[PDB]
Symmetry: none
Subunit: 99 residues, 10 copies
């Protein structure tokens, strides 16, 4: 009694080719303020700025001039992944028994 | 009684090729303010700045001039991953028994 | 009774090729303010700056001129990973029994 | 009764090729303000600056001129990882029994 | 009853090739303000500067001119890892029994 | 927001009387050959006798005479638990505010 | 936000009386051949006798005469637990505010 | 934010009376051949006798006469636990504020 | 933020009475052949006798006469635990504020 | 932020009475052949006798006559633990503020 996963049993001349969570020619960008955090009975005053900010608690005037460019953000480019003859493979198996 | 995973049993002439969490030609950028943090009965006043900031608690004037460029963020480029004949493989198995 | 993982049992002439968390031609950049931190009954006033900042608690004037460029952030470039004939492989196995 | 992982049992003429957390041609850059820290009943006033800052607790004027360039951040470039014929391999196994 | 990991049992003519946490042609740069620190009932006023800073507790004026370039950060370049015929391998095993 | 169990919240003049897995005047007898055992790939030839036994692997004659009494087993007697005025209580609470 | 168990919150003049796994006037007898044992790849030939036994591996005759009494087993008697006025209590709480 | 167990919070004039795994007037008898044992790759030939035994590996005759009494086993008697006025208590708490 | 167990917080005039694993008038008898033992790659031939035994490896005759009494076992008697007025208490707390 | 156990915090006029693993009027008898032993690659031939034994490796006759009494075992008696007015207490606390 075989109990299995992502594989074989019996099967003389058996090939198991397993790719799991595999990346090839991959452009991953992640911008994350809070990933996997736990707050138990806490009291915070967090603040995050990407770009230009003019922060004050108590003030009288606040001027924020943007005459230029404020470019921000998460960017991911995957270009010309396979150019030419090329080959990208994942979990490739075979049995050749030519005569 | 075989209990298994990502593999084989019996199968004379058996090949197991397993790729797990494999990267090839991969551009990963991560910008993360808080990953995996725990706060138990704490009291914080955190602050993070990416770019230009003009921070004050008590003030009277605040001027933030951006006549130029403020470029920020998470960027990932994967370009020309396989140029030419090329070969990227993961978890490749085979049995050749040619006569 | 075999209990296994990422492998084989029985299978005369068996090959196990396992790649786990493998990187090849990989550009990983990580910018992280807090990774895996624990705060138990603490009281902090943290502050992080990437770029230009003008910080004060008590002040009267605050001017932040950016006439130039403020470039910041997490960048990862993977370019021309395999140029030419080339070969990148992970977890490659085979049995050759040619006659 | 065999209990195993990333390997084989029985299998006369067996090859186990295991790569775990392997890097080849990898450009990893990490910029991290706090990794794996513990605060138990503590009281801190931390501050980190990457770039230009103008910090004061009590002041009257604060001018921050950036007429030039303030370039900062975490960068990772993996270029031309395999140029030419080339070969990068991880966890490569085989059995050759040619006649 | 064999209990093992990253290896084989039985298997006359057996090869075990194991690479764990191996680096080849790897450019790793780490810039970390605090890695693995513990604070138990402590009271600190830490401050770290990468670049230009103008710090004061009590002051009246603060001018920070950047007419030039302030370049900072964590950089890692892996270029032309395998140029030419070349060979990088990790955890390579085989059995050859040619006749 | 109170999240609780086997108790109260608010309720000025509150009594919580909790008895859990409490025994009073209890006769517990347990006769158990195997409680909470684990066998992983083992090979045993166990044998337990309560009373009279005549055990042999290889023999020619076997006579077992019981002219008397063979009394065995698990017995538990709880008699006259509360004789007389008596009092057995568990998890008893009250508020008395008589005028 | 109170998260609790077997107790109270708020409740001026609060009593918490908790009895857990408490025994009073309890007769517990346990006869157990194997409690909480682990066998990993072992090979045993255990044997336990309570009473009379006539054990042999290789023999020719075996006579077991029981003309008397063989009394065995697990016995637990709890008799006259509370005789007379008496008092057995567990987890008893109260608030008395008589005027 | 209170996180607790077997107790109280707030509750001016609070009493916590906690009895855990408490015995009073308790007769516990335990007869156990093996409690909490571990066998890793071992080979034993254990044998335990309570009473009369006639053990041999190789023999020719075996006679076991029991003309008398063989009394064995685990016994626990709890008798007259509270005789008379008496008092057994566990985890008893109260607040008395009589006027 | 209070995180506690078997106790109280706030609660002016607070009493914590905690009894854990307490015995009073307790008769505990334990007869155990093996408690908490570890066998790693060992080979034993243990043997324990409580009562009468007639042990041999190689023999020709074996006679075991029991004309008398063989009394054995684990016994625990708790009798007249509280005789008379008496008092047994565990984890008793109170607040008395009578006027 | 108080993190505690078996005690109190705040609570002016606070009493903590803690009894842990306390015995009073307790009769504990333990008969144990092996408690807490470790065997690593050892080879033993242990043997324990409580009572009468007739042990031989190689013999021809073996007679074991028990015309008398063989009394053995683990016995524990706790009798008349509190006779008379009496008092046994454990973890008793109180606050008395009578007017």
């Amino acid at each position: 009694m075989d109990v299995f996963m992502k594989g074989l049993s019996k099967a003389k001349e058996g090939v198991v080719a397993a790719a799991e969570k595999t990346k090839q020619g991959v452009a991953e960008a992640a911008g994350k303020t809070k990933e996997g955090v736990l707050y138990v009975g806490s009291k915070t005053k967090e603040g995050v700025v990407h770009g230009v900010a003019t922060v004050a608690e108590k003030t009288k005037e606040q001027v924020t001039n943007v005459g230029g460019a404020v470019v921000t953000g998460v960017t991911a480019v995957a270009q010309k992944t396979v150019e030419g003859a090329g080959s990208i493979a994942a979990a490739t198996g075979f049995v050749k028994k030519d005569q």
